[PDB]
Motif scaffolding. Sequence first.
Motif, PDB file in Angstrom:
ATOM      1  N   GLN A  22       0.863  -1.202   0.000  1.00 41.28           N
ATOM      2  CA  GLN A  22       0.000   0.000   0.000  1.00 41.28           C
ATOM      3  C   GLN A  22       0.887   1.235   0.000  1.00 41.28           C
ATOM      4  O   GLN A  22       2.061   1.243   0.362  1.00 41.28           O
ATOM      5  CB  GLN A  22      -0.765   0.208   1.262  1.00 41.28           C
ATOM      6  CG  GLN A  22      -1.606  -0.931   1.735  1.00 41.28           C
ATOM      7  CD  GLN A  22      -2.541  -0.223   2.725  1.00 41.28           C
ATOM      8  OE1 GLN A  22      -2.232   0.064   3.872  1.00 41.28           O
ATOM      9  NE2 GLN A  22      -3.728   0.085   2.187  1.00 41.28           N
TER      10      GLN A  22
ATOM     11  N   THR B  38      -5.015  -0.224  -7.520  1.00 45.18           N
ATOM     12  CA  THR B  38      -6.400   0.019  -7.092  1.00 45.18           C
ATOM     13  C   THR B  38      -6.451   1.227  -6.149  1.00 45.18           C
ATOM     14  O   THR B  38      -5.489   1.490  -5.424  1.00 45.18           O
ATOM     15  CB  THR B  38      -6.797  -1.285  -6.387  1.00 45.18           C
ATOM     16  OG1 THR B  38      -7.933  -1.739  -7.066  1.00 45.18           O
ATOM     17  CG2 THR B  38      -7.020  -1.255  -4.868  1.00 45.18           C
TER      18      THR B  38
ATOM     19  N   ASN C 258      -8.229   2.634  -2.744  1.00 41.14           N
ATOM     20  CA  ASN C 258      -9.098   2.187  -1.690  1.00 41.14           C
ATOM     21  C   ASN C 258      -9.307   3.388  -0.851  1.00 41.14           C
ATOM     22  O   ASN C 258      -8.396   3.947  -0.252  1.00 41.14           O
ATOM     23  CB  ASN C 258      -8.374   1.233  -0.784  1.00 41.14           C
ATOM     24  CG  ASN C 258      -9.110  -0.112  -0.863  1.00 41.14           C
ATOM     25  OD1 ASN C 258      -8.730  -1.021  -1.609  1.00 41.14           O
ATOM     26  ND2 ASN C 258     -10.213  -0.220  -0.059  1.00 41.14           N
TER      27      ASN C 258
ATOM     28  N   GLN D 204     -13.132   0.009  -2.856  1.00 45.01           N
ATOM     29  CA  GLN D 204     -12.035  -0.155  -3.806  1.00 45.01           C
ATOM     30  C   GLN D 204     -12.522   0.281  -5.225  1.00 45.01           C
ATOM     31  O   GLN D 204     -13.663   0.092  -5.647  1.00 45.01           O
ATOM     32  CB  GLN D 204     -11.699  -1.615  -3.707  1.00 45.01           C
ATOM     33  CG  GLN D 204     -10.594  -1.923  -4.675  1.00 45.01           C
ATOM     34  CD  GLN D 204     -10.375  -3.425  -4.544  1.00 45.01           C
ATOM     35  OE1 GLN D 204     -10.867  -4.210  -5.341  1.00 45.01           O
ATOM     36  NE2 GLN D 204      -9.637  -3.790  -3.464  1.00 45.01           N
TER      37      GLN D 204
ATOM     38  N   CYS E  28      -7.796   7.744   1.912  1.00 47.23           N
ATOM     39  CA  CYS E  28      -7.567   7.014   0.661  1.00 47.23           C
ATOM     40  C   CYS E  28      -6.119   6.472   0.592  1.00 47.23           C
ATOM     41  O   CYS E  28      -5.167   7.222   0.818  1.00 47.23           O
ATOM     42  CB  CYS E  28      -7.839   8.032  -0.451  1.00 47.23           C
ATOM     43  SG  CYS E  28      -7.784   7.332  -2.107  1.00 47.23           S
TER      44      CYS E  28
END
Lengths: 99, 99
Positions: free
Chosen positions: A2, A96, A98, B2, B95
Motif C-alpha cells: 500500500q 487500485t 481504496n 475499492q 484514501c
Amino acid sequence: PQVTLWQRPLVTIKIGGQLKEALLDTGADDTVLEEMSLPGRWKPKMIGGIGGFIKVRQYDQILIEICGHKAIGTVLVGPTPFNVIGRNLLTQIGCTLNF
Amino acid sequence: PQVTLWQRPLVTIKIGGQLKEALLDTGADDTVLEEMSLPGRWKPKMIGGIGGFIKVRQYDQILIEICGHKAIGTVLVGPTPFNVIGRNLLTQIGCTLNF
Ligand SMILES: O=C1N(Cc2ccc(CO)cc2)[C@H](Cc2ccccc2)[C@H](O)[C@@H](O)[C@@H](Cc2ccccc2)N1Cc1ccc(CO)cc1
C-alpha cells in the motif's frame, strides 16, 4: 505495497535501459515522461493539462518495469515537469484505489 | 470502496451547497476546482501543471463532502478543465493506493 498519500507516491521505473522515478497518478490517462532517449518510431500529439497543452511524442509498445512488475504500453515523451504513470499502465500493474 | 482504474475515478462532491464531480487524483498535491461561487475571501496563488501555470485563488478551511465523508481544507478555485481532488483531501478521507 500500500501507499498512503501523506507523501508524493513515487516509484522507480526502468525504461529504455535507464532508471528513473515516477509519480503514480490516477488523474492521468496516459503516461508522460520527461524528454528521454527511446529508440524508435513515434507519432507526435498534444495533451492538455492544467495549464495548457503540450506537444509530446507517442511511442507505443514500450516496456517499463515499474517497482518490479513489467508492462508494455504507450508512453508519451515531452516537456513535463515530472514523469507521471497514468492509468493505461496502472491498470496493468494491478493498482487500485481504496477508500 | 475499492476503485479499479479502467475508467477515470470520479466521485460526487458536495461543496458550498453545490454538487459536482471530481477526479481522485494522486498526482496532485492540492485540490483544484473549476470556477464557482464560494464565500469567504481568498488569496491569489499560482500553480504549475503540464501546459504551464495558472493563477488560482486559495480558500482555506472549506468543508467539502466527498462520498459521505467530510473533510476541511484548502481548495484552489480557478481555470482547471476538470475538478481534481488532490492529496491534501485524499489523506483525510483515508484514501490509499494499492498494488
Ligand atoms: O496537469 C496535470 N494533469 C494533466 C495531465 C493530463 C493528461 C496526462 C496524460 O494523459 C497527464 C497529465 C493531471 C490533472 C488533469 C487531469 C485532466 C485534465 C486536466 C488536468 C494529473 O492528474 C495531475 O497529477 C498533474 C500531472 C503533473 C504531475 C506532476 C507535475 C506536473 C504535472 N497535473 C498538474 C497539476 C498540478 C498541481 C495540482 C494541484 O496541486 C493539480 C494538477
